[PDB]
């Protein structure tokens, strides 16, 4: 619904291109942090990560014109599918994204019963991450547990 113009937006892109202060077309904690430290001079070492992960609507690798474009324009996050396992889903979403890279696991899986050290939680999700794109997307969470 509604096709965003590439003309005006592109202008926003012109900034998003300089905003990268490199000419890569992707904003990551690397470049973003540089400015966030010399300009923003505040954002914690982990914040820019939470800031980047917060913009990772598509979470493909880093900040991109489209993902950053939406997050800047709107801020909606509906959901119409999670019928079952929706409880464990919120229980495992900890942060509040949908994927369990490790954070959620760490706290939830350590409080759930055992104590998955930073080693287990890291590797477990590394080997558990069926797709192995970099994180654990519910799509696999269910396809592995729910789906045969």
């Amino acid at each position: 619904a509604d096709q965003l113009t590439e003309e005006q937006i592109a202008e926003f892109k012109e900034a998003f291109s300089l905003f990268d202060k490199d000419g890569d077309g992707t904003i990551t904690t690397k470049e973003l942090g540089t400015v966030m430290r010399s300009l923003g001079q505040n954002p914690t070492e982990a914040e820019l990560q939470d800031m980047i992960n917060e913009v990772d609507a598509d979470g493909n690798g880093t900040i991109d014109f489209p993902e950053f474009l939406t997050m800047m324009a709107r801020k909606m996050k509906d959901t119409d599918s999670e019928e079952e396992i929706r409880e464990a889903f919120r229980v495992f979403d900890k942060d509040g994204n949908g994927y369990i890279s490790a954070a959620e696991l760490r706290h939830v899986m350590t409080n759930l019963g055992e104590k998955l050290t930073d080693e287990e939680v890291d590797e477990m999700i590394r080997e558990a991450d069926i797709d192995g794109d970099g994180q654990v997307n519910y799509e696999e969470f269910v396809q592995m547990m729910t789906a045969k």
Partner: peptide, 20 residues
């Protein structure tokens, strides 16, 4: 063996059995 599979899957299962 690999650690994880049927580990944290069972975790959730743990809850359900005794949600509280």
């Amino acid at each position: 063996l690999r650690r994880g599979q049927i580990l944290w899957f069972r975790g959730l299962n743990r809850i359900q059995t005794q949600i509280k």
